[PDB]
Ligand binder design. Structure first.
Ligand SMILES: C=CC1=C(C)c2cc3[nH]c(cc4nc(cc5[nH]c(cc1n2)c(C)c5C=C)C(C)=C4CCC(=O)O)c(CCC(=O)O)c3C
Ligand SMILES: CCCCCCCC/C=C/CCCCCCCC(=O)OC[C@H](O)CO
Ligand SMILES: CCCCCCCC/C=C/CCCCCCCC(=O)OC[C@H](O)CO
Ligand SMILES: CCCCCCCC/C=C/CCCCCCCC(=O)OC[C@H](O)CO
Ligand SMILES: CCCCCCCC/C=C/CCCCCCCC(=O)OC[C@H](O)CO
Ligand SMILES: CCCCCCCC/C=C/CCCCCCCC(=O)OC[C@H](O)CO
Ligand SMILES: CCCCCCCC/C=C\CCCCCCCC(=O)OC[C@H](O)CO
Ligand SMILES: CCCCCCCC/C=C\CCCCCCCC(=O)OC[C@H](O)CO
Ligand SMILES: CCCCCCCC/C=C\CCCCCCCC(=O)OC[C@H](O)CO
Ligand SMILES: CCCCCCCC/C=C\CCCCCCCC(=O)OC[C@H](O)CO
Lengths: 157, 157
């Protein structure tokens, strides 16, 4: 088991895809006007938490990918990253809060699944995913509350 | 080497994240009005091309993920899939064409890298990414020609 830099930089580069979704956001008065739970962090917290988790999940996948029988784990990981990349555009871009809520739940389930598979192969890779899963749970709660506490128009069918 | 239905259905399900980008953002009226290159294919072509490629890439990844030392190849697979998911919301959603070109070029590099890495472990998995790399090369040209042939629109530059 090593710090393998070809693996870790490949997974890190991969997190460049969700990274662009967040960067390409402007200040948005639609989001500024939303009612929000008291525990909603300020917007500057999110790039730093997401950045940290990009490093933690890339370090976790890096370990797992040096181990035998890791295919199912890395299938869960590919699915996790892909629905994570899809959420931000759906919520902030298209402003479809219901559809984004379905998305972040499919994400949460694949994050939990990865973490679990990771735990069957490597406790540290599993442990590295725990703050991801927590952050994903809060993200689900935030999307859910944005929809509970606000007016939603109908989405394009 | 087998038909692993859990592996395959996981990779296919991960393809649900990109498949969702098209469903929510079908080619726009704004997209119709862009000047297109002469070889631009009709509009029914793209849903059947992407749908085939999700089955083909999921099948390829399923073979590879059963093999030993497939970590790096699976790492490339997560990388291409994420940049794939990111591309449609950048080009069709935000209409930021120049950023989209960067995105689809990075995607192309990671599709080439997955293919190459698939060939090192399983010849069939490599063969099945061949039409993907071909199609990603066509996607890249379309994105380039969309900017080239619509350079007077601010969203192209
Ligand atoms: C430009 C304006 C930016 C805003 C409003 C911002 C704020 C946000 N970023 C979010 C997600 C995010 N923040 C993120 C990394 C970055 N974000 C960045 C720029 C921004 N980050 C930069 C730069 C990043 C990398 C260096 C990413 C990548 C997401 C999308 C979640 C994900 O896919 O990782 C969310 C949704 C909550 C969550 O992640 O749970 C908010 C409110
Ligand atoms: C904002 C947080 C997101 C951060 C965004 C990423 C930033 C870091 C960039 C590094 C990419 C480098 C690419 C690394 C790919 C290396 C491929 C390689 O090593 O291949 C070896 C293989 O064994 C034979 O091909
Ligand atoms: C909820 C509790 C966990 C979530 C808290 C989120 C904060 C960040 C935590 C990271 C854990 C790992 C930190 C230390 C890194 C592990 C050490 C490592 O793995 O290197 C050892 C190697 O095996 C040679 O001995
Ligand atoms: C177009 C994108 C959308 C595509 C939709 C994605 C498909 C999801 C399937 C759900 C049913 C779940 C059934 C999964 C069956 C598990 C198979 C199983 O456990 O078999 C053991 C395995 O073969 C060990 O080698
Ligand atoms: C419209 C499309 C957008 C949303 C589509 C999302 C699809 C929903 C989730 C599918 C899970 C399918 C997972 C099938 C594989 C899981 C089985 C498994 O985990 O098996 C593990 C075991 O250890 C190995 O034998
Ligand atoms: C590190 C991995 C390598 C991949 C990284 C990808 C970055 C490339 C970015 C390109 C942006 C656009 C630059 C080229 C713009 C051509 C469009 C153009 O302007 O067309 C000519 C003119 O407009 C007609 O009148
Ligand atoms: C939501 C934000 C909360 C999370 C914020 C985290 C900030 C960084 C803190 C933890 C450092 C963890 C260090 C991880 C180092 C483990 C990588 C590694 O050492 O892997 C084993 C190595 O290859 C030899 O065996
Ligand atoms: C099924 C998977 C979705 C489950 C996702 C977990 C949803 C939990 C939402 C949540 O716990 O948010 C905090 C709560 O709203 C604070 O009072
Ligand atoms: C083999 C995997 C398929 C991907 C190939 C992408 C390359 C171009 C696709 C279409 C033209 C190829 C000939 C297709 C012949 C079938 C005729 C057809 O389906 O036409 C649809 C109908 O016209 C709707 O209006
Ligand atoms: C504009 C650029 C267009 C061209 C794009 C080029 C980039 C693709 C890279 C190499 C392809 C070769 C992939 C396979 C490399 C050797 C594989 C090998 O070992 O054999 C494979 C097979 O399993 C038994 O021979």
């Amino acid at each position: 088991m090593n710090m393998d830099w070809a693996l870790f930089l490949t997974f890190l580069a991969a997190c460049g895809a969700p990274a662009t979704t967040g960067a390409l956001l402007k200040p948005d008065e639609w989001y500024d006007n939303l009612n929000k739970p008291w525990w909603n962090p300020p917007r500057w917290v999110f790039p730093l938490a997401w950045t940290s988790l990009y490093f933690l999940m890339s370090l976790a996948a890096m370990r797992v990918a040096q181990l035998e029988g890791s295919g199912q784990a890395l299938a869960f990981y590919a699915a996790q990253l892909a629905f994570n990349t899809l959420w931000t555009p759906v919520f902030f871009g298209m402003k479809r809060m219901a559809t984004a809520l379905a998305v972040v739940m499919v994400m949460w389930l694949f994050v939990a699944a990865t973490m679990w598979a990771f735990f069957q192969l490597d406790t540290w890779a599993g442990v590295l995913f725990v703050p991801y899963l927590i952050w994903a749970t809060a993200t689900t709660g935030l999307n859910f509350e944005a929809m509970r506490l606000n007016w939603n128009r109908p989405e394009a069918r």
